[PDB]
Amino acid sequence: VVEAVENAVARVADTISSGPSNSQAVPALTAVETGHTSQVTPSDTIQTRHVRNYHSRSESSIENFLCRSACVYMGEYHTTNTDTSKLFASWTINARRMVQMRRKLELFTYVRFDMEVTFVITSKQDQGTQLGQDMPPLTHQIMYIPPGGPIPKSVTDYTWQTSTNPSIFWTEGNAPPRMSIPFISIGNAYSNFYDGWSHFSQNGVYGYNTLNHMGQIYVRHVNGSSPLPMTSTVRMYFKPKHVKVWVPRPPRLCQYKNASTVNFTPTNITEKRQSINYIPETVKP
Amino acid sequence: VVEAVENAVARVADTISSGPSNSQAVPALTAVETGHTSQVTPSDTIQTRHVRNYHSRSESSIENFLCRSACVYMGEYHTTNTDTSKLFASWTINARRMVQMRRKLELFTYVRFDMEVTFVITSKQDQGTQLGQDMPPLTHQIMYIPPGGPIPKSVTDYTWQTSTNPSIFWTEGNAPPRMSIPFISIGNAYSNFYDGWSHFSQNGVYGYNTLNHMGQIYVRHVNGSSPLPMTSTVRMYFKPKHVKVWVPRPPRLCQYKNASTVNFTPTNITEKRQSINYIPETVKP
Amino acid sequence: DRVRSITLGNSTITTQESANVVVAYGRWPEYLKDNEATAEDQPTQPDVATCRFYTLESVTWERDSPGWWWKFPDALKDMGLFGQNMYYHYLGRAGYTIHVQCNASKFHQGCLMVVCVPEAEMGCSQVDGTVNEHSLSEGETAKKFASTSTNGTNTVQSIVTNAGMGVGVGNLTIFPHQWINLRTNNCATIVMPYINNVPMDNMFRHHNFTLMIIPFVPLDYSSDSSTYVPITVTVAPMCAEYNGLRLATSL
Amino acid sequence: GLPVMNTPGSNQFLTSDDFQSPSAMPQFDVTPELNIPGEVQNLMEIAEVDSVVPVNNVEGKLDTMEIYRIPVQSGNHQSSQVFGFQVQPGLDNVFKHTLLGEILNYYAHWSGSIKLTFVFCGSAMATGKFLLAYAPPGANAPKSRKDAMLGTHIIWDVGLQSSCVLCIPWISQTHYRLVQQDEYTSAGNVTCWYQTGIVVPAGTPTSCSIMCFVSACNDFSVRLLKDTPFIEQSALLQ
Amino acid sequence: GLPVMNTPGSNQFLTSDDFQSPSAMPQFDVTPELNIPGEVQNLMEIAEVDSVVPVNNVEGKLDTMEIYRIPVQSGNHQSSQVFGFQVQPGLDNVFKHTLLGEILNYYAHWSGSIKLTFVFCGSAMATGKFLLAYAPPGANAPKSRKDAMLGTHIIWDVGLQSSCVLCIPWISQTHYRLVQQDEYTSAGNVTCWYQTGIVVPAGTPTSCSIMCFVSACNDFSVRLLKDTPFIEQSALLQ
Amino acid sequence: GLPVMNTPGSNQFLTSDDFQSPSAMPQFDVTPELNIPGEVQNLMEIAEVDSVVPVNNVEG
Amino acid sequence: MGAQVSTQKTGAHIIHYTNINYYKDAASNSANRQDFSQDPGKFTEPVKDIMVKSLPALN
Amino acid sequence: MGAQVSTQKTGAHIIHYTNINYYKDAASNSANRQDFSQDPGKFTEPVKDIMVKSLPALN
Amino acid sequence: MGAQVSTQKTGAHIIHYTNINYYKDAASNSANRQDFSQDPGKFTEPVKDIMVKSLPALN
Ligand SMILES: CCCCCCCCCCCCC/C=C/[C@H](O)[C@H](N)CO
Ligand SMILES: CCCCCCCCCCCCC/C=C/[C@H](O)[C@H](N)CO
């Protein structure tokens, strides 16, 4: 069986031919007080020729705009140390620490989508005086813990049994690991802004951290080895797909300060020029 | 040829609209002495609006509940030693040594399914004063011995010929090995609890070990090498599929003591609070 | 074409110099339907005791005035039976009709922007800090935008150019809005539906939208023209529903 | 051969994957299926069965049957409250080890209505009436019968039928609540009061007890599987 | 098995690929979809909305509302020019932080017509007429009303309608221009002049101001996605 | 998954191969085609045009 | 060629997939994740005489 | 065998492709890059009374 | 399933092949090596009046 699926191409409007006019129709006179934006084209104000326009608005749809991978977290962890908390990495899941993807997401109030997640892991040797040894390939474990699950205390804790938590095992020299996640929220859509509190007495925690609660990630080395110490760095990449967004907002002007708040320092509207009439001259012999 | 298979979605019941009432129907008066559980809904006791409910009970079916991989065994073995019994690992097959999967399985009296088995093998260097050598990739052999087969005495025993036993050969740096096993029991379904003996005189062995008898696993290094000693650890993961279960039971309250018995230490029913009326106040300015 | 009349409950507004009416995203308020509900108890719908125009207190537009904002709900929690139905239930839901009035003579000048911002989350003047609710809202009294950068603790960073949200104030036209240009009209009207990511919500915990009034062209006049020019707001809830009746909460 | 290209995710072990794999025992012939009574097809069938709630979980009673009995008696005790607890079916000590609680602790999200059945276990000559009330979140718990009567309640009259059902209906702003409940997804409280009092004739014991059963309704469901925090070990062979 | 051969590109991570991948949560049941007002389907819907242009971006006014007002007054000021700027919707300081500018800075190529709306915010008793002119590239910007009148222009008469639209039509030798405009893809300039002057009666303020709004027409489009230069950090947790 | 076996020639770069490859710019919208005069379809069209021969190629 | 086509798990308020079996034993097939039946009356109502729920339980 | 055939993105002035779904969940499918709808009037014309654009806005 | 079958390049004096497109963009397809058109008169005979070749070129 084969099924033919049709794809409607969507191009921009053609401009029509127009001639001289002398009448009572005033397309160029409006009133912005109504909250309405004028729908006037060049053919209403000047004389125009007919043009057949073949341009398409395909790369500005929301799906093509948001469906690319971006880094959201980077972290380090060791194979040998004297701290036992630096032997594994762990963090809470969100998209608020890297400013590019998070400014791109905050153009809208609410978003809903599935996700594709990729990891990029690299290792390196720690600076020691005596070098020289052959080491077998390293293996890494990534575990996702939804809220309420037990938390590892070390790299040999029983919790890495991962009986019900989903985990990834990977070894260096292969393709980067990848998996997809569905839309997981107790609400009908994700919320990027929340003008409210956590306690009914209008106090407690304000803003975004009240609503996310999506678990944690833990990463470790599996070998448990290496008399000479090594160091690994893990980077995580998000890619949304099957997207829907609501209620657009003005883009962020000020620089970000931290991952919890919308706090900012006052910034200008733009940079200056000489005077309200200044023109740069570019046609000179 | 293509065959279309239909999947019936199963959602929860809608709540219907209900108004005031004054009659002799008493839906809220029952008697628990009968052993019957009351089938009353909110619309029988209060006034309700009509709601169309789209929620589905898909993740609480037995198959989705049990079809995940869990660790059931971990073991160590060396390439060089002075014991010749620590050069290979061996164990009897069951699912009673890791408490998470075994508590999950014991919600039912009888179970029947096929299995998917995965192995995760890692190696490491033994702590010596002089390091530095290049070692070729290591290869490992896993052999399953059904009850009655000959038992290896060393890592060079003839029994690793594996002429009729199924074995796996694997080398480090590849994907983890995996294979599937059908439902192998002389009974019609597996038994998680057995309130009986092995001898007709009502003595001998009591309980679970009377009925399982499913063979052993042996694992070794194939290289037979390494003037500097190494150590490997093997972990085994089970995943049941095509499941059926019977006769549900109350979940285990006390902690487990050993893998043979159901022995326990007396535990409380829950933890305490201040008094039978205690309420935590959370609405305070 | 410039005259309009709006009736709700036992209240009516007339106007003789209106521009038009903005319907936020082409959507009128309506009640919750059966295939979108999650709460199971029968809801209450008062329908004329709550859905009527309430008037707040007025502000004075001066020659150097930065602007004002209110938070909705929590500006109507002491208004008649709407406030009482807010205090006894756990869940509420309503749309709104907003009407802003400001009149002046043909010898005055000035221009105001009237905008409704959903989920307007604000920042503190201390960047290593958090806001409190008194700095966000004073009920029926308005908060005041500032003229420069603010300092000190516990106050909101309120210089008008950033609108206290870290954006450019000239882009707020992305939201539902109108203008009051003193030579053209004397009132603005916005009809706002219920906008949230869940079908109902608690009305004390969550501010659904902020109302901002920002002058772009200051007020000016000459020798002996009137100096006192007030601005007045009037709001009416629509399709109001409540769920989860228990004893009255106390703030 | 056929040209191919490997994508990210190759050669990984995901513990919730669903693939095919070769059989280590080709053409093995399994034992025929037997029709054993009591087959289970969904975990929600177990959560719809009543189980006894340990309402009296105070110091000194955690290992006796007294943990299950609610005490009532005759005389003027109207100002005294009978019992009260929060609605947290997987979090509160009162509900966490029951059947419904044990099933919920394998999941992260729950939704639906909850049934509480009360049974009077006094003599056949004792009479009385009680008020059973559920309050929604947003206020503090009631301190008197007058406050409690304003929420969702039922008046139970003791007679030839021994049992009365209080149904807690799903009233929430979100579709699901967390099993690990916080202040944002709170669900309210339940309280009991004397509506008239207990009256007995001469020759009867004065004190009586009440028992409470919990179960789930036919609109109930859970999601987001996780591991449970009630079982643990410190080494293998356990 | 089946014979195959691997091609170049195997085992690489391209950040704009489109493949299938296994699910880490098999058979997860998502929350039903709600019909929230204000759904967006294309970024061009946002760029077609008017936003205010900061035409008066001179020293000392970058953080006040005065940055948005264009000053005009009564008396003989015909020889003075009102305002002027280049047409660089993603490059010039005048246009770069508006809605249209902010959308264009995510892209490399743009094309289409541009709408500028002007609103007079003086008293109801003031009268005047203005000339709004757009000149194509190839010459220097006009220095007088006589030069400016030779290009594409409109004469705005102030009255009961407060707003006048100057439409800049797409006149270009290439199909697309660069968002980072150079001399090769220049687009021209816009200037304003007094056509008659402002006349007021006694008792009215003499000075008035004009405001300008920018938006895109229905033949507008962009392409070649890129990262924006307006946001940046020096370390994580920002 | 599906059982497979790799043949000789795997993971090589032949500079005259003809395979498919993933796009680094998904759904990019190209400029429309213009009808420019003088389109060439085969190199033999150029060799059929006369050109002048340097017959007198002697020293100086 | 012995292909099965069935619907995918979606939401509510192109959507089907294809499967081929590669092996000779049915124990090699993937899990049956899309079968949702119920029979709760076996555990909640195991009584000989039917109880109406609007009538008294006794008498 | 549950194959979808659809047209490719080309220019203007052999062109279709084939897809098979391999997984049971729809969250595993690839992105929907070929849906191009618009509704700008929701943001640019949100007024109760219609405005003709050749007529005056007021009076 | 959107398969194209076409003839192979052979000699003169079983021979066809199959192709499937895997990607959504046409820039991902393989080269068009089997299109052989010609129009030499554009470069060799670009004159307004036709020249017969058995007649004199002039007179
Ligand atoms: C260990 C294998 C699985 C790896 C775990 C990855 C799962 C990550 C949880 C999915 C969360 C994706 C949606 C969250 C993003 C935020 O909602 C956005 N910033 C908008 O709110
Ligand atoms: C060497 C390659 C094959 C690897 C050998 C693995 C075969 C394992 C035997 C299958 C046993 C699976 C069923 C046993 C589990 C118990 O029955 C459960 N705990 C319930 O009784």
Tokens representing E161?
A: 């309608």
Q: What is the dihedral of CA E74, E77, E80, E82, to 10 degrees?
A: 20
Nearest Cα residue to atom 17 of ligand 2 = B190
Write out the residue range of the structural domain in which residue C183 sits: 1-251
Q: What is the DSSP letter of E21?
A: -
Contact E125 C173 (CB under 8 A): no
CB G28 within 8 A of CB D21: yes
CA neighbor of D46 nearest in space, from D179, D216, D172: D216
Two tokens, residue B68: 């995940």
Shortest CA distance to A179 belongs to which of C64, I33, H28, B194? H28
| Contact by Cβ (8 Å): E134, A62 | no
Longest dimension (CA), chain E: 98
d(CA D105, CA A41): 62
Q: Is G47 exposed, middle or buried (0-12, 13-18, 19+ CB in 10 A)?
A: exposed
Residues in chain B: 285
Which residue type, as a one-letter code, is found at position C12? T
Report the neighbours of G using a cutoff of 3 or more CB pairs below 8 angstroms. Answer: A, B, D, E, F, H
DSSP string, C73-105: SSSSTTSHHHHHHHHHEEEEEEEEEEEEE----
Separation of alpha carbons E147 and E153, rounded Å: 11
Contacts of D73 by beta carbon, 8 Å cutoff, 6+ apart: D198, D206, D207, D208
Q: Are A245 and E42 in contact (CB under 8 A)?
A: no
- Cα–Cα distance for residue pair C223/E75, rounded to 1 Å: 19
Chain D residues whose beta carbon lies within 8 Å of the beta carbon of residue E4: 1-4
Cα A240 to Cα A182: distance, rounded to the nearest angstrom = 10
Q: Which of C183, C213, C215 has its CA nearest to residue C65?
A: C215
Sign of CA dihedral B85, B86, B88, B90: positive
Residues 6+ apart with CB under 8 A from H28: A180, E20, E21, E22, E23, H21, H22
Q: Which residues of I touch H1 (CB under 8 A)?
A: 1
B214 close to ligand 2 (CB < 6 Angstrom): yes
Strand partners, E70: E210
What are A206's strand-pairing partners?
A197
Give residue for tokens 């609209």: B17
| Structure obtained using | cryo-EM
Phi, psi values for residue E235, rounded to 5°: -165, 165
- Chain E CB contacts of H59 under 8 Å are 160
**Total number of domains in chain G:** 1
Number of domains, chain C = 1
CA distance linking residue B134 with residue B129, whole number of Å: 16
Query: B144 CB less than 6 Å from ligand 2?
Result: yes
Q: Show the domain range for H14.
A: 1-59
Q: Do the beta carbons of residue E153 and residue E134 sit within 8 Å?
A: yes
Query: Residue A142 in 3-state DSSP?
Result: strand
DSSP β-ladder status, C22-23 and C187-192: parallel
Chain F interface, Cβ < 8 Å to E: 2-7, 9-11, 13, 17, 19, 21-26, 28-29, 31-32
Sorted by sequence, the CB contacts under 8 Å of residue F58 that are 6+ apart come out as none
CB A264 within 8 A of CB C168: no
What is the distance between the alpha carbons of residues D136 and C246, in angstroms, rounded to a whole number? Answer: 6
Within a 10 A sphere around the Cβ of C17, how many other Cβ atoms? 14
∠ CA C131-C135-C137, nearest 5°, is 120
Gaps in chain I following residue numbers (C to N > 2.5 A) = 13
Q: Rounded to a whole number, what is the distance in angstroms from the first to the last CA of chain H?
A: 65
Question: CA A89: distance to chain centroid?
Answer: 22
Query: How many C-alpha atoms does A7 have within 13 Å on its Cβ side?
Result: 19
DSSP state of D233: -
Q: In which element (H, E) is residue E238 found?
A: none
Which is nearest to A56 in space by CA: B67, E11, H35?
A: H35
The reply to whether residue F44 touches residue I38, judged by beta carbons under 8 angstroms, is yes
The helix or strand, by DSSP H or E, that contains position C133, with its residue range, turns out to be helix C133-136
Cβ atoms of D105 and B246 within 8 Å: the answer is no
Distance CA F11, CA D1 (A): 12
User: Could you tell me how many residues make up chain E?
Assistant: 238
CB within 8 A of B257, min separation 6: which ones?
Answer: B263, B264, B265, D238
CA distance B57 to D42: 8
Tokens of E174: 């290439």
How far apart CA D112 and CA D110 sit, in angstroms, is 7
Q: Which residue has the tokens 């006094």?
A: D122
**D202 Cβ contact partners less than 8 Å away, ≥ 6 residues apart:** none
Q: Give how far the C-alpha of residue A138 lies from the chain's centroid of Cα atoms, to the nearest Å.
A: 30
How far from the centroid of its chain's Cα atoms is residue D65's Cα? 19
* Cα distance between residue C21 and residue C28, in whole Å: 12
> H/E element holding A99?
helix A99-105
Q: What is the Rg, in whole angstroms, of the alpha carbon atoms belonging to chain E?
A: 25
Under a CB-based contact definition with an 8 Å cutoff, are residues B56 and E29 in contact?
yes
Distance separating alpha carbons of residues B27 and B40, to the nearest angstrom: 7
User: Position of tokens 């549950």?
Assistant: H2
- Residue whose tokens read 């709408």: E115
CA distance readout (Å), D94 to D62, D91, D136, D190:
12, 8, 19, 12
User: In sequence order, what are the residues at sequence separation of 6 or more whose Cβ sits closer than 8 angstroms to the Cβ of residue F56?
Assistant: none
The residues that bridge with C23 in the sheet, in sequence order, are C191
Task: Please say whether the beta carbons of B244 and D38 come within 8 A.
Answer: no
In chain C the first and final C-alpha atoms are separated, in Å, by: 46
Contact D130/D195 with Cβ under 8 angstroms? yes
Cis before residue F3, ω within 30 degrees of 0?
no
Tell me the chain H residues in contact with residue I29 when contact means C-beta distances shorter than 8 Å.
8
In this structure, the number of other CB atoms found within 10 A of the CB of residue C236 comes to 23
Give backbone dihedrals phi and psi of D171, rounded to 5 degrees, phi first: -125, 105
In angstroms, this model's resolution equals: 2.3
CA distances from A25 to A21, A22, A30, A32 (A): 9, 8, 12, 18
Sort strands A70-78 and A230-248 into parallel, antiparallel or unpaired: antiparallel
* Cα dihedral F15, F16, F17, F20 in deg (nearest 10): 80
- What phi and psi values does residue E32 have, to the nearest 5 degrees? -60, 155
Q: Which 8-state DSSP code applies to residue D173? A: S
Which has the closest alpha carbon to C246: E46, E130, A258, D191? D191
Both tokens of G50, joined, read 């039917």
Asked whether C53 and C79 are in contact (CB, 8 A), the reply is no
Q: What is the spatial order of strands in the sheet that A2-5 belongs to?
A: A2-5, H3-7, H16-19
Output the CA–CA distances (angstroms, integers) from residue B279 to D85, D87, D187, in the order listed: 7, 11, 13
- E27: CB partners within 8 A, 6+ apart: B58, B59, B64, G9, G33, G34, H24, H25
Q: What type of residue is E94?
A: V
- Chain F partners (3+ C-beta pairs within 8 A): A, D, E, G, H, I
Structure tokens at C56: 């707040």
C-alpha B73 to ligand 2 mean position (Å): 12
Report the candidate in D68, D69, D105, D113 with the shortest Cα–Cα distance to residue D87.
D113
H/E stretch holding E56:
none
Name residues whose C-beta falls within 8 Å of residue E117's C-beta, 6 or more positions apart in sequence: A30, A32, A38, E50, E163, E164, E165, E166, E212, E213, E214, E215
| Torsion (CA) C85, C86, C87, C90 in degrees, nearest 10 | 110
Q: What whole-number distance in Å separates Cα of residue D176 and Cα of residue B53?
A: 13
- Alpha-carbon gap: F32 to the closest alpha carbon of chain G (Å): 31
The bridge status of strand E39-40 relative to strand D129-135 is unpaired
Contact A169, A223 (CB under 8 A): no
What are the C-alpha distances in Å from I57 to residues D117, E63, I40, I41? 115, 81, 20, 17
Joined together, the tokens standing for residue C199 give 């079908």
- Residue F10, Cα to own-chain centre: how many angstroms? 24
Distance CA B63, CA B241 (A): 7
Closest CA to A111 of A245, A264, A255: A245
Amino acid at residue number E150: L
Tokens for A257, please give them. Answer: 């300060």
Count of Cβ atoms closer than 10 Å to residue E35 Cβ: 11
Given the CA of residue B167, which atom of ligand 2 is nearest to it?
1
Calpha distance D160→G57 (Å, rounded): 10
Residue B80 CA to residue B135 CA, distance in Å, equals 14
Q: For residues E17 and F22, is the Cβ–Cβ distance under 8 A?
A: yes
Q: How far is CA E48 from CA A270, D126, G26, H44, in A?
A: 22, 78, 59, 7
**Which structure tokens are listed for A49?**
């020729």
Instruction: Write out the two tokens for B11.
Output: 């959602």
- Gap between the Cα atoms of E169 and E147, Å rounded: 20
| Contact by Cβ (8 Å): A226, A105 | no
DSSP C86: H
Q: Which ligand 2 atom minimizes the distance to the CA of B117?
A: 6
Which residue is closest in CA terms to ligand 2's atom 4? Answer: B144
Cβ atoms of residues D136 and C246 within 8 Å:
yes
Tokens linked to E25 = 């949560």
Edge to edge, the sheet with strand A167-171 lists A88-92, A216-221, A139-145, A167-171
In sequence order, the β-bridge partners of residue A92 are A216
d(CA C77, CA C74): 5
Read off the tokens for D123. 């003599």
Rounded CA separation C145/C66 (Å): 6
User: How far is it, in rounded angstroms, from Cα D112 to Cα D221?
Assistant: 7
Listed in sequence order, the residues at least 6 apart from F21 whose beta carbon sits closer than 8 Å to its beta carbon are E7, E8, E9, I28
Q: Are strands C143-144 and C230-245 parallel, antiparallel or unpaired?
A: unpaired
Beta-bridge partner residues of B178: B118
* Residue that has been written with the tokens 């290094």 in this structure: B221
Q: Which of B181, B193, B241, B247 to mutate to test the pocket of ligand 2 (most atoms within 8 A of CB)?
A: B181
Q: Do chains H and F touch (3 or more CB pairs under 8 A)?
A: yes
What are the boundaries of each domain within chain D?
1-238
Gap between the Cα atoms of A200 and D137, Å rounded: 9
AA identity, residue D47 = A
Q: Within a 13 Å sphere around the CA of A84, how many CA atoms are in the beta-carbon half? A: 5
DSSP state of F7: P
Burial class of residue E172 in the structure, from the number of CB atoms within 10 Å of its CB (0-12 exposed, 13-18 middle, 19+ buried)? middle
Pairing of strands B178-181, B2-5: unpaired
Helix, strand, coil shares, percent, chain G, to 5: 10, 15, 70
Report d(CA G27, CA D150) in Å as an integer: 60
Q: Which residues of I touch H8 (CB under 8 A)?
A: 21, 24-26, 29
Whether the Cβ atoms of residue C109 and residue C246 lie closer than 8 Å to each other:
no
Closest CA to E40 of G47, A63, B58: A63
